[PDB]
Structure formats: C-alpha cells, structure tokens
Amino acid sequence: ENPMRELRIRKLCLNICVGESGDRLTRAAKVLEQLTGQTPVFSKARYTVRSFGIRRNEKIAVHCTVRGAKAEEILEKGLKVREYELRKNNFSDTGNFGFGIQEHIDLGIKYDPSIGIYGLDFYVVLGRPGFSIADKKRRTGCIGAKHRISKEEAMRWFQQKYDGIILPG
Amino acid sequence: TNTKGKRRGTRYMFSRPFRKHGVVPLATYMRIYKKGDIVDIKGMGTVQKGMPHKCYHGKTGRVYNVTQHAVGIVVNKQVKGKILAKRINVRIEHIKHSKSRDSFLKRVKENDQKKKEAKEKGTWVQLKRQPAPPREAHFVRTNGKEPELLEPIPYEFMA
Amino acid sequence: GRRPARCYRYCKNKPYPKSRFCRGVPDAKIRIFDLGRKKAKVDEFPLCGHMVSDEYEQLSSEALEAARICANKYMVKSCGKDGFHIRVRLHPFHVIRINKMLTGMRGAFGKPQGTVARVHIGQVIMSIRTKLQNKEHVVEALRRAKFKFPGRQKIHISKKWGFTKFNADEFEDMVAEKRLIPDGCGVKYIPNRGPLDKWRALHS
Amino acid sequence: FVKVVKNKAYFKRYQVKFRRRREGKTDYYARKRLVIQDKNKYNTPKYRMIVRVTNRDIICQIAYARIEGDMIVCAAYAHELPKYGVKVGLTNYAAAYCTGLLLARRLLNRFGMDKIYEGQVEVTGDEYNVESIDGQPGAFTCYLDAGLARTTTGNKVFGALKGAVDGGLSIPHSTKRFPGYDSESKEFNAEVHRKHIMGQNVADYMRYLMEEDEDAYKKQFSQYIKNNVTPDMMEEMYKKAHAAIRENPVYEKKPKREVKKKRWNRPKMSLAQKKDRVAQKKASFLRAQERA
RNA sequence: UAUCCGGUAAAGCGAAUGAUUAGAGGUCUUGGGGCCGAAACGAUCUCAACCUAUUCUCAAACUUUAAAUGGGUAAGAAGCC
RNA sequence: GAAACCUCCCGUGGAGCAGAAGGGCAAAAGCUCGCUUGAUCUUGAUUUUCAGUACGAAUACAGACCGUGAAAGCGGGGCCU
RNA sequence: GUCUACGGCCAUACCACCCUGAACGCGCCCGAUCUCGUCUGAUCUCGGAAGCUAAGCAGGGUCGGGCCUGGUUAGUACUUGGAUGGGAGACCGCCUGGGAAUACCGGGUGCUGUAGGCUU
Ligand SMILES: [Mg+2]
Ligand SMILES: [Mg+2]
Ligand SMILES: [Mg+2]
Ligand SMILES: [Mg+2]
Ligand SMILES: [Mg+2]
Ligand SMILES: [Mg+2]
Ligand SMILES: [Mg+2]
Ligand SMILES: [Mg+2]
Ligand SMILES: [Mg+2]
Ligand SMILES: [Mg+2]
Ligand SMILES: [Mg+2]
Question: How many Cβ atoms sit within 10 Å of the Cβ of residue C148?
Fold first, then answer.
C-alpha cells in the first residue's frame, strides 16, 4: 500500500559509438533519429588515442536521451530483441540497468547498403517521484536513503514489469 | 641580497586562516568608516584589489578619506631613524575598527555620569585610574584542618 | 673513504632531509630497523630494554647498523634466535654534506655525503623486548651496542609492557576486562566512546 | 571496496559553506554587489525590491541591509489578493503584477507619497519610469532582487517589477525581458505585455482547452471553474483588483490570540537519560546472551 | 590598563603535504614467482602495490595547534555635550 | 580491451586558472556560450623601491566617451606578487 | 510550540544511518496553450492543484564520526633578563620573570535580527 515510491523510468539513454567521425557518424545519427523521433547529439573525444584512431575534439559517437512514453516504448522494443533476459551484472549498484543490441534492424528499422548496421546501447535510468530535487536549481538536496533504488529493487521491478528472467552467472 | 617584490614574505600574512577561506562575509563590507575613525589594517588574501603593503599589516591608523569602496587612512611607519605619518588607500576588506579607542570612550562616558552625579551630593569621587596597588592586610582562616605538607619528590628516570 | 665520525657529531645545522631540494643523496647504511621474532604477540615478550641517549648529538646511519648487528648477534648467541624482538628507533633522515678538495672556499656548499639521525637527550635509540627470564642478556646486548655509538647513553629497563605504552603493572588487568586488546606486536586500546555495536563485538 | 573518501581527516579539513548557500537560497556573489553601499553614502540605505515566486505564492518585499540582518520596510503577498478581487491563479503573471503593484502602493502610503506618484494607471505595458517631482519629496528608489531566478524574457519576477513601477517606485529596468520583446528582431510590443498583465494568455488557454476537450479543461482549471471565473470575466477581474489596490493598499493583519501553548515537537533528551539508556542496553545485552 | 598584529621556539603527524618502520586485518586490487592443483578468488604459502584499524621515527624551503621576547594604536580642551 | 562514447553515485577542490614558486579562488577567479573593446581620452593624490629622487609596477578617486548586464553593479588590460 | 521570505554570525549549524511531523506554510506533484529554453518540458520558463509526506525541509535519536568548549598533558616543553655557576666539549643546573601543544578524559551539538503565517 505504498503511495509514490513507484519505481518509474526516469530516462532511457541511447548511444552509437562509431569512433570514426565524418560520414559514418552522421549516418548513425539518422538511425537514432528514426528510432527515437528526435535529433541526436554528437559527442566529441576527450583526447587523442593513436591506438583507437581518434583525435582530441574529433566526433566519435552519437547519442540521445528519451523520456516518458517514447522512452518506455523504445525500451520495450530493446527488451524484445534481447528476449527479456538480463543478468545480475547488467544491473548497476545504483538501481539502473542497461543492455546492448547487436544490430538496430532487429528493433524495427529497414537496412540500407549505405545506412548499414549500427548496433547500439540501451541504458535505462530508473527513478522515483521526487528525484528532481538533486538537479533543480534553488533548494537542492540529496534523495534521502530509503528512497534511493537498490540493485535488488530495480531487479524485482524488471522481473515484474517486463516479465523478465534475470539469469545467473 | 633580497628581492624588493611587493608581496615577498607574505606566504602566511595574506592567507585566510584554517577553514575560513571562500566568501567574505558581508558585515565586513557593510560597516561605516567616518573621518577620524581609528582603524587597524590587516591584509586579506581573497580580496586582492586595494591590498595594503605588508609593512602596514598589523599597523593601526586613522581614516582621512572615504571613497566608494575604499578608505584613505593615515598610518605611522618607521623608516630607520624617522617616523613618517603617511596616507594609504586601502579597500574596506582589509580593515576593521580598532577597539583600542572604545574602552577610553566608555571611561569618558562613565566619568561624565559620575561628574553630573556626585556634584549635587558634594562627595568628590576618584576619576583618574590607579595602578593595581599592594594587596592589603587580611586574615587567612585555616578552618579546622591544618596546612598540607609538601615534600619534594624523589627522582626517577622514566624514558 | 668517508670522513671520521668526529666531524659530523654535534647537531650544528638545521635539518636537511632528503626531499625535492636535497637530492642525489646516497642511501643510508641502516635499512632493517627491526629483527628477532617480530611476528610475536604482546603477551609472549614483556621486558622493554631501552638504550637511551644522554647527549644532543648525531648518530650516523653506519653506527646505527653496527650497533644493531652487535646487539642482535649477542642476543642470538645468548638466549636464542627466536627469543627476542629488537626495534631500532632512530632512522637517519638528516643529510650530511661534504665540501671536497681535489679553487678554495669559494662556492663551498656540500654534496650529500650520507645520512644521520639526530638524537635528543632522554630519547631512545634502540629497544629490545623479551622474557622476564632474560633481563641480564638484554642489558649486556645493549651494553655491547653502546661501544658502537659516540657520546654517552644509559641502558634502562622500562616499566612498560613490551613495546606498548601501557604500564606493565596494569597490563594484565586492562586486557582481561577489555580496555586493551592484542594486535600483533602491539595492543589496541578500546575506549568507552565508540558506537555500542563495537562494544557488542566484545563481551560476546 | 575502495579508499574511504570521507575519513576523519576529510571532515577535519572540511569547511562548510554559508548557511543560506548550503540551504540553496542566497547567491552571495550577487548579494554583495546588490546590497552593500558606497561608503561615502555612509548610513543611508540601499533598498531592494525582493521578489520570490513560490509554488503556490508570490512574495514581494522591500528591504535594505543592516548588519544585524536585512530589515524589511514593507511586504505584499499573493495570498492577500482575495481581499482585492483575485480569487485564483495567484502564482500567475497577472497576480505577480498585482502583488508588485500592491507592494509599491503600500510603501507609498507609509511615506505619505500616495497622492504624489500615482504612476501609470491605464496599464499600457510600455516603457514607464517615474520622474521625481520638483518641490516634492523624491521618488522611492529600489533595485530588483531576482534571487536564483533564471531571468529570461517573460519571468514573473519582472511582472512584479512592472507592477511596482506602475505603482510609482523608481526601479531601473530595460524592457528586454518583459514578455512582448522579440529576440529575433529586437523590438517590444507592449500590447502582448498588456495581455499577459491582464491574464489573457491564461484566458486563451482556457478557451483553447474548452474547444478541444472538456475533460482536460475540467482537470487543468478546476479551482477556476469553481468560484465561477470564465475567460471573458478575466480581464475585468484584474482591472477591478488593480483599482481596489490603488484605493487602499494598507495591511491590518489579524488579532491573533487564544493559544493553548503545547509542544507539537519532541524535546531534546537530557544527558542523564542518554547516560541511563546505554547502561540499560549494556545490561540488556548481557542478560540476553546469558541464556543461549 | 585596554586593544590589534605575528607563525619563530615548542609541538604535531591515529590532522593535510611530503617522508618513513613494523606487525595485526583485508580474494578490495590485481598481479608476478611458487608449492598441491589439468585448471578452478579451489587449498596453501608468497611477495607487489592499494586499502581497515594500529605502530616506529622525521621536515630551513610541511602544518591543525602555538609560546616567551616583540610591533602598532589608545589612555581628553585639537575632548565631551 | 587499463585507455574511445554513454549513465548513476561519491567527490573541500586532492583539478584548473599562459609561465617560476607562494598566496588566492566552487551557483568562482575554473570550464562553455552570448555580446564586446575599460588594453580608449584626461587632471592631479597615493603606495611600492626610496634619498623618502627617478624609472618601472601598482592603489584609490575625479572628469569624458564607451562596453556589458533585467538591474545593483563590474570594467580604464592580464586574480595578486 | 513552530514555520515561510530576506537575513547576521558562519559545523554547538557538517556528515552518516534511524524514528516522528497537528495546522499553516515549504515542497514533491500534474500539465505545455502562451512566455522561455532544451537532443530531451529532466533542468530552465510558463499554466495549474488530482494526489502525497515517500523524498526535500523541520524536530528528535546514536556509550556515532566531525566541530565547539573545559580538564589533563604540565609549571613539562620552550623562553626575557643574570652570574668569574657546572661541564674537556656536547650540553646541563640555579636565580628573575613569562609559559605552550598532541595522545588521554569530560561536557555541548546552532544562536539570533526584520517582515509575514499557523497552533484561532
Ligand atoms: Mg684522518
Ligand atoms: Mg651550519
Ligand atoms: Mg547572477
Ligand atoms: Mg617564517
Ligand atoms: Mg621545530
Ligand atoms: Mg570614469
Ligand atoms: Mg582571467
Ligand atoms: Mg514537468
Ligand atoms: Mg518530508
Ligand atoms: Mg518520514
Ligand atoms: Mg562526539
């Protein structure tokens, strides 16, 4: 009989790290645009790495955050591709979870020989009502303690909500 | 030979005390210095505009000018043989009221009270101060119990 | 090779530790500041025989080594290999300089010759713990080690249990209640203060 | 496991920030600039028209800063506007205007400058500012203290400012962030602003919802529908309120008494009790373990 | 007699910075070498660095503390009301 | 993959602020944007070296013309040396 | 009793976890037409008032850490002035005045200004 300790999805985060810049990256942006229904953002590199073939301030990856119903919908698709299996290690200690998908066409998008096959990275930030305190401007605060989402508490949400398994190992 | 640099040897002088860095609390800025107010300079690292020179740190002096956010202040500085009253412009943050004078003002106020009163009475009262005199004749009552004997203690080597 | 100890005896200079500034310091002769059965519990070695200085002088790193060896060698021959623990309690930190002469006194400021420890009057140099059986052998072990130092030092037997800070008359009583708790060579002192869950680990 | 970030040492070296900075209220960087005087002014005040928008409220205060703690010359709230006419939408721009007006009028009645400095009555919305009349006591002057409000075009803080200005306080302002200014052109309307002042932006949204879907309108404007406040009744309502404010701004409080004087709180536990508690826990721990 | 200033002596390092001994505890990390293991955070040691309480000893160019001696002002008619 | 990008949490500053080092700095003095030319024109006063002369460097004002900001303000080069 | 707004001094106010919060407030909260701003109404801005004290916030708790303040440490360390004092020196004792700091052990754990609520 809890009132508003209702574990919800705060945001879903998506990124395609191509590590190439120029055209490959712009091509991947289109895929994220098709999936989410919103322009994404290019993230540039922190610094040069000669092994990976990237340069400081060169555009490596493209990412985008989705919130609310659209986020819920795209999360569902991602889980359908994964077949509603996650692991113990997939949940973070902070009560969030994430998972990859090995190719975006499995969600529900058409391939193209140009616009190829970009795999991507679902990360789900769970939350609760009254989590905004942390990031609002004026009378900020920390979200108590018996309020923070444990790893276990997010696992049981996922087991309930999306009917998942959470396999061991 | 030493460097003539302005801030040479102010590693500890202009350095905010332990756990008192950060914002300068506002009372500092919002208290009024008139002309002729005795004021004790004390540099402060945070505010760097209008710092006084290291020689005048610790020195007290009187105010002779009051600009927007600074105060001209006559101080005495010694120079080998000769003392030079000289006038420096220090930004408020490096300055306090010297309480030195206030105890005197209190004493004048007490004398004026004690001069208005005790005039219609006739009994003239001690107005001047007087140094701590010899501590008077008095009895010490060793009430019942005798005094406690104190032997010096025998040596032993601890460490 | 190196100078006589004579010249670098008295504590003349300010302390000149090996640091950012003082570098290219050749390493100290003494290195192992303790030996014997150092893996021994408080209760199986209570004696605490110190060698205490009586001059404000400098002991060379070389001297401290020689003294240690001297004391350890005799301890082993006397009682046994694993019947004592010796703690040297002066590390050579102070660096000691050497203006060398193949120009004259122009620009003289030394290179680091070596290291040295400064000792105050009443400060401890070496210390040994063993059994109440073995008082005599400790005394002679330190006596022998005196001859490797300059100046004058007394050998003194403490009123403390082992190498602890706790008076040996009170030790056993403090242990049983649980003011004190064994902790390798040392002994952890538990006070009142700490949350009551710490208290509940003891008394159980 | 990891290195414990917060040791004894950490706390030992740690400096707390100021209380109001911790609490997340006072921007001390801005406060220094805002509030202190030029020393050659000496003991003359420096007033600020504080404006703070709460979730359900709008507070406007005028205050100078004394060393004991900044003193409030005069204050007006949004929850007073029920007296004057405004029933609902009290955190809204139009109410913010009223609050700021009310404040200005209240201040002016204290100094006897109610009759002088009538200010702007018709409510144009345009650039207005109060010239001090010669041979008469000068206009009151204060500065706008926004606080931690992101001052952007159309912030209710400036609504209160506008109200005060129209009330007759010489507060300096541009019109760059009155709602009506166009960022991609750089001119002011002052008809757009007028509408916002008289709740027409609310009224229109009230009309747009009723047209679209009844259920949403009913949800969004429940307390508007209760009390009977229609879209076409809106503009008039605010104009009446302004006139009521203008005619009498004075505050009379309520004569509060008949208090039981009881402790809702919990008093602090005495040393001896705490000293006892631990002894009981110790005893309890011993007696419990001497069984199993 | 009031009232400011100070960072030397001392002290401290279970307080920061830097140095530094030892055992207790810790698969935190992980390793490199082992021994018993096909191999296994399996068992057993080990030495690396890191950490949890403790412990030994230090600093002209470190310091939470912090003296003695010391430097300003002030102690009225150019002042009060 | 120890290192690419994203996310949550801890984080008194252990980073950064052109350079030596010291001080100073967290809804900044750091970073990222937006608009700019107070690094402009002009009297004196003062400080620092001091002989209490210069230079340099600085501090407080005052008069102009500007910038910026909703505004209080801040700005006549570089957080201070 | 206590809160809100703006505060002063800036830990006796900090941190950790635990409990309790009447009424008014403060909040979370529900929306995005307009204003405004985002990759994203998350923040920011705006329009609200269906829920709820879960969280923030307040009050209390912990043989809590920290901080504040006493003791102890100790008349110890150090130190002004003095001697044809000692000592081969290193250093030490005395006289004359001044006099600290850890460890260890206690107590305390925000005060309060202006303006406006509530407990009528
Ligand atoms: Mg020879
Ligand atoms: Mg020398
Ligand atoms: Mg601001
Ligand atoms: Mg010095
Ligand atoms: Mg020293
Ligand atoms: Mg000018
Ligand atoms: Mg700069
Ligand atoms: Mg929202
Ligand atoms: Mg709550
Ligand atoms: Mg609760
Ligand atoms: Mg405590």
Answer: 17
Both tokens of residue B80? 């080998």
Residue type, C91: H
Tell me the β-bridge partners of C154.
C52
List D61's β-bridge partners, or say none.
D50, D75
How many residues in total does chain D contain?
292
**Chain A residues with CB inside 8 Å of D148's CB?**
137-138
- Asked whether D62 and D48 are in contact (CB, 8 A), the reply is yes
Integer Cα distance of A70 and D237 in angstroms: 41
The minimum CA-CA distance between D27 and chain B, rounded to whole Å, is: 11
Per DSSP, what are the bridge partners of residue D288? Answer: none
What are all long-range contacts of D278-282, with beta carbons under 8 Å and residues at least 24 apart? D278/C196, D281/C196, D282/C196, D282/C199
Q: Which residue has the tokens 């713990």?
A: C129
CA distance C121 to chain D (A): 33
Q: Give the number of other CB atoms < 10 A from CB of residue B31.
A: 14
Distance, CA of C147 to CA of C63 (rounded, Å)? 10
Residue C20: exposed, middle, or buried by beta-carbon count in 10 A (0-12, 13-18, 19+)?
exposed
Going from the Cα of A131 to the center of ligand 9, the distance in angstroms, rounded, reads 13
Method: cryo-EM
C130 phi and psi angles, rounded to 5 deg:
-160, -145
Give start and end residues of each alpha helix (H) in B17-146: 100-116
CA of C13 to C1' of G29 (A): 72
User: How far is the C-alpha of A98 from the C-alpha of A12, rounded, in Å?
Assistant: 9
What span, in angstroms and rounded, lies between the C-alpha atoms of A83 and A76? 10
Interface test with D, best of A132, A133, A136, A138 (most D CBs within 10 A): A138
Resolution (A): 3.7
Inter-chain contacts counted by CB atoms under 8 A, chains A and D: 11
User: B155: CA distance to ligand 5 center in Å?
Assistant: 29
Q: Compute the residue count for chain B.
A: 159
Q: For D82 and G2, how far is CA from C1' in angstroms?
A: 26
D90, D144, D99: which is closest to D245 by C-alpha?
D99
Residue holding tokens 């001390």? D28
**Mutate which of D39, D40, D48 to disrupt the B interface (most B C-beta within 10 Å)?**
D39
Count Cα atoms within 13 angstroms, Cβ side, for B148: 2
SS3 assignment, position D146: coil
Q: Take residue D109 and report the two structure tokens written for it.
A: 């009645």
Q: C-alpha distances in angstroms, D133 versus B137, C97, D117, D138, D155?
A: 78, 85, 8, 7, 31
Q: Which residues of B touch D35 (CB under 8 A)?
A: 26, 30
